[PDB]
C-alpha cells in the first residue's frame, strides 16, 4: 500500500489532504503520514513568493527524510500586504502539482499587530473554521476553501495525458 | 427592494453572484441585473495586475452607468503563465470587498496556443463545469470555485465593525 507524506504534523492539514484524496481517487487507497520538517522561510511568510517557496522547501526536504512515498503534499499559509491565503504543493517522483487558495481581506486592526510578529492574533478560533470561518459566518472554513485548492493542485496527475513531464 | 448590479451580463456569472448573496444573506431582499460595460483592459488578461484591474474598471464604469444600486459587483477571469484565476470585487457606496480565486494550471497544449476559446478543443462539453469542471473529474466546477471567491469578497460587509471605510 503506497504511502503519502504530508510536509506538516498538524492533524487539520493532513486531514485535508486525506479528504482531497479520497474524494479525488476514490479507487484507491494509501497510508497518509504527517512529518515535521523545516520550511527554511520565516514562520510567517510576508509574501505570495516566499509562501510558495516555504511549501515547496517543505516537500524537498520531506523526499530527502523520508524517501519512497507516492505523492509529497506541502501546504504553507501566508500573507501579502492585508490578504492571506495559503498554496498547496503536491509531488510524485516525476510530476508537480500546484494551487494556492482563494485569498482573504483580513482586519486592519489584526494585520497591523501582525506585522509585529505578533495567527492567536484572531481574537477580538482553530476550531470553529479558523480566520476564515470566523470571517464568513461560518459560510466557508479554511477546511473547505484548503480542499478546492487541494483538488486543484492534482490537476496534472488527474489528467496525464495532458501534463507532462 | 435593493438592487445590485452585476458587471457582466453573463448568466453564469449573474447566478453565481446571487447564491453568494443568498447564502450570506438567507433572508433580505434586492434584485440582480446583469450589466454590460468595457473593462478597459485587454480581451484576455495576461497577469494577476491586469485582470484585477478590468474588474476594478467594469464596476467603477457599472457605478457610473447605473448609479443607485447598493452593491456593485466585477467578475473577471484571467491568466499568468500557466495559470487562470478570476478576480471577484464587490463595491457599496462606502467600501470594498475583493478576491482572488484558487488558481489552476492549465494544460502546455493550452498555453501553446492561446483566446481562452482553445478549451472548446480538448465542442461545448466546456458547460460542464467549465475547465475546472472537465479538469477535476467535476469534483469542481467554475461555479463551485467562483463561490467561494464571492463569499471571501463580501467579508468587509459581513464584519462592518472589524472592516470601516
Ligand atoms: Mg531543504
Ligand atoms: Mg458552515
Ligand atoms: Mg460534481
Known amino acids: 500500500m503506497r504511502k503519502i507524506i ?12 486525506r479528504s482531497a484524496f479520497s474524494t479525488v481517487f476514490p479507487d484507491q487507497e494509501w497510508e497518509f503520514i504527517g ?22 522547501n517543505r516537500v524537498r526536504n520531506a523526499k530527502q527524510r523520508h524517501p519512497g ?3 509529497y503534499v506541502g501546504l504553507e499559509a501566508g500573507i501579502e500586504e ?21 485569498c482573504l481581506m483580513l ?4 494585520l497591523e499587530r501582525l506585522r509585529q510578529a505578533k495567527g ?9 473554521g479558523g480566520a476564515i470561518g470566523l470571517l464568513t459566518r461560518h459560510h466557508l472554513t479554511r477546511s473547505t476553501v484548503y480542499h478546492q485548492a487541494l483538488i486543484l493542485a492534482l490537476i496534472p496527475f488527474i489528467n496525464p495525458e495532458h501534463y507532462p513531464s
Open 69 to 71: 512515498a507516492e505523492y
Open 120 to 128: 492567536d492574533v484572531m481574537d477580538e478560533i482553530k476550531q470553529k
Open 107 to 110: 482586519p486592519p486592526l489584526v
Open 6 to 17: 504530508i510536509a506538516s504534523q498538524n492533524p487539520a492539514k493532513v486531514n485535508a489532504v
Open 82 to 102: 492585508n490578504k492571506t491565503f495559503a498554496w498547496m504543493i503536491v509531488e510524485s517522483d516525476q510530476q508537480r502539482g500546484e494551487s494556492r487558495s482563494a
Open 35 to 56: 512529518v515535521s520538517v523545516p520550511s527554511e522561510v520565516a514562520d510567517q511568510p510576508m509574501s505570495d513568493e516566499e509562501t510558495k517557496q516555504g511549501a515547496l
